[PDB]
């Protein structure tokens, strides 16, 4: 879609930022992120901390977690590993538990400034069903 | 300056208005265009010898759209401060004083527009 | 406010009448017979209509109207004698003649420059009819008004060259 | 039109009237043209007919677009890997039917011919061998191409 259905002015700035990055850079990461920004909310399901903790269990540590959705909290996870997560939104419990474990929280414009190619990024989605 | 910006020639594809079907016979029917909805209507089916239906093929050229034959564009003006908005558009826009503006306020508008070079389309109304 | 506004009231004489209980159609044809006539000839004509010596030609409202030889002066065949319309038009003509006398105009040169019969608001009357209906018997009154008036280059160079040569020769 | 001749006209890219294509003669393509004989006129063109069609009405398929063949460059960007770098190689490939005929003929947009100067014939829906216009003519298609150009 040419125009996002959202009326968020900050989402419009993110679409403009990632339109320039998808046009001028040959990285297919930027094209995927731009596509997911255009999708609706039911097509952007939440991703809990326990699901991304599954995906850093192997050698995927020290890689930036990128989720084009809002990251929730799981009460079933007793310990949260140190991790660097970039997302559209974070809940208060998810942001507090990541920062208590020693990690850091980024927005998608901070990810663009830090990793414009999406280098060493572990990209995730939530459960569709 | 009175002369407008240089433009391509203004072409009107059709100057005649589009008359509503059977508005000539009935006085309860205004001549404003209404699209016929009957399946057997000859205007709807585009039979020859009948009234034409408007379409996007009659659309005017984008470079000459909304231009009066002098070559300017109309801009409705209610006071002196509206004329000063046309300060940088001497070659492209013209001023049109609104119908409810009084006689004293009009004289201020023309005097300012002559200073600014802006053409007034109805400068001789209340003189 | 009269209908003919091009005629100034200073040099003219006018007289009008409203809600006159005469037939509008008979008065329209009577006013058309005397339109543009002299004042003394119109007064003589209207009295002849009363005495049934001259006839008023019926032109528009003449449906199933009888024929007479007095319409041959007008070039028609259907002509009638509206006595009631002639009586009302005499009094309005005598009124305008008195208005000219008071103003000082000459009555011998007065013509009827404007005369108009307009429709008045309709009066109502009812009569009795069978099958549950009531017959409406509306009257059609008329408004009359009359006014009396005293009777009394961008040539080219080639065109300009031909003009000079004809003038010289 | 019956359903079978309709599909062949689509497969031969004859979607419009007065539309022309170049066909390599095989046994598979000859039976295609035999069915659409009540709708087409065909024959064997010479060097002149190939030249005027390419030079005057020659357009190329570039990214799904109809680009006129006004430069030797745009031939080289599209058929340069096949060994075709200019107009004369394109004309040589159509006339002397080479291995890259399929790529060169498909690169050419179907030719939008005009109606012939001088008309067809008194009645043109009979076969050419009974005084009509439909069917196969050996070299008289060159007289038809000259009028339609």
């Amino acid at each position: 879609r040419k125009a996002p259905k959202s009326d968020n002015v900050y989402l419009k700035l993110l679409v403009k930022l990632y339109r320039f990055l998808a046009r001028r850079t040959e990285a297919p990461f930027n094209k995927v992120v731009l596509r997911r920004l255009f999708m609706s909310r039911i097509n952007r399901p939440p991703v809990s901390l326990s699901r991304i903790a599954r995906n850093l269990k192997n050698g995927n540590e020290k890689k930036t977690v990128v989720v084009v959705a809002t990251v929730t909290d799981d009460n079933r996870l007793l310990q949260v590993p140190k991790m660097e997560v970039a997302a559209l939104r974070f809940t208060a419990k998810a942001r507090a538990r990541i920062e208590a474990a020693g990690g850091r929280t980024l927005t998608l414009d901070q990810l663009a400034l830090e990793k414009p190619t999406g280098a060493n990024t572990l990209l995730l989605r939530g459960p569709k069903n | 300056m009175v002369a407008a910006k240089k433009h391509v020639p203004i072409v009107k594809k059709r100057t005649k208005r589009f008359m509503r079907h059977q508005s000539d016979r009935f006085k309860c029917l205004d001549s404003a265009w209404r699209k016929p909805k009957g399946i057997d209507n000859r205007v709807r089916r585009r039979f020859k010898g009948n009234l034409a239906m408007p379409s996007i093929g009659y659309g005017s050229n984008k470079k000459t759209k909304h231009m009066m034959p002098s070559g300017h564009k109309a801009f409705l003006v209610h006071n002196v401060k509206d004329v000063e908005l046309l300060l940088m558009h001497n070659r492209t826009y013209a001023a049109e004083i609104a119908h409810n503006v009084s006689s004293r306020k009009r004289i201020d508008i023309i005097t300012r527009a002559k200073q600014l070079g802006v053409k007034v389309t109805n400068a001789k109304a209340k003189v | 406010r009269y209908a003919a506004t091009e005629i100034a009231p200073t040099k003219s004489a006018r007289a009008r009448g409203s809600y006159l209980r005469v037939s509008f159609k008979n008065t329209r044809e009577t006013a058309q017979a005397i339109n543009g006539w002299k004042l003394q000839r119109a007064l003589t004509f209207l009295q002849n209509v009363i005495d049934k010596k001259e006839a008023v030609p019926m032109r528009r409202y003449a449906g199933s109207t009888g024929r007479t030889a007095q319409g041959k002066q007008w070039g028609v065949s259907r002509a009638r004698w509206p006595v009631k319309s002639a009586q009302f038009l005499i009094g309005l003509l005598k009124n305008a003649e008195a208005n000219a006398d008071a103003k000082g105009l000459d009555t011998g040169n007065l013509i009827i420059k404007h005369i108009q019969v307009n429709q008045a608001p309709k009066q109502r009357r009812r009569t009795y009819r069978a099958h549950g209906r009531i017959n409406p018997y509306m009257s059609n009154p008329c408004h009359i008004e009359l006014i009396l008036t005293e009777a009394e280059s961008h040539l080219s160079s080639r065109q300009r060259g031909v003009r000079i040569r004809r003038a010289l020769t | 039109i019956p359903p079978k001749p309709r599909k062949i006209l689509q497969l031969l890219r004859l979607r419009q009237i007065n539309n022309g294509v170049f066909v390599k003669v095989t046994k598979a393509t000859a039976e295609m043209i035999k069915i659409v004989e009540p709708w087409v006129a065909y024959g064997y063109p010479n060097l002149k007919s190939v030249r005027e069609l390419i030079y005057k009405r020659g357009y190329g398929k570039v990214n799904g677009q109809r680009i006129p063949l006004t430069d030797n460059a745009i031939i080289e960007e599209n058929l340069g890997k096949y060994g075709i770098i200019c107009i004369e190689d394109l004309i040589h490939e159509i006339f002397t039917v080479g291995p890259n005929f399929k790529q060169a003929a498909n690169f050419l947009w179907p030719f939008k011919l005009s109606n012939p100067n001088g008309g067809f014939r008194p009645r043109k829906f009979k076969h050419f061998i009974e005084g009509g216009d439909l069917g196969n003519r050996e070299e008289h298609i060159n007289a038809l191409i000259r009028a339609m150009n």
């Binding site: 002015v9 700035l13 | 564009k73 109309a74 908005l85 300060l87 940088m88 600014l116 | - | -």
Partner: protein, 139 residues
């Protein structure tokens, strides 16, 4: 931060108190707007760096934003009045708008606005008498 020139444009693109639009075009009443067109380029109030030229008694009055004083409107405008030859007014405005990278894209519009103001302060010529035209109007 939360606010920027890009964000203010998104809030005020559709509706603005300076916005005037009718059919033929969309204009702006902003004093910091030069050419008086509604766009991100000429939106003086939206942009951090902007220029605006208003008439004076004799000459032009050029105002410019100071980026350090953006939250202090009483001292946010750097005002210079050029009452001199028109050539020196144009040169100083061009230097003001292009020498130090303060809106070099607006240099042409700034010089053109100073010309149009000073073209309005010259004495005006009397209009020729209107000619009666045609048979009906002349008679």
């Amino acid at each position: 931060s939360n606010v920027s020139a890009d964000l203010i444009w998104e809030v005020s693109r559709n509706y603005n108190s300076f916005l005037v639009k009718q059919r033929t075009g969309t204009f702006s009443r902003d004093a910091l707007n030069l050419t008086n067109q509604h766009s991100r380029k000429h939106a003086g109030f939206v942009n951090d760096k902007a220029l605006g030229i208003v008439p004076a008694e004799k000459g032009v009055k050029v105002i410019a934003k100071k980026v350090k004083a953006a939250n202090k409107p009483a001292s946010s405008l750097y005002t210079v009045t050029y009452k001199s030859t028109a050539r020196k007014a144009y040169k100083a405005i061009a230097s003001q708008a292009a020498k130090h990278g303060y809106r070099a894209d607006l240099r042409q519009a700034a010089v053109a606005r100073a010309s149009a103001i000073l073209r309005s302060q010259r004495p005006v010529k009397p209009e020729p008498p209107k000619k009666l035209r045609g048979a009906a109007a002349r008679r």
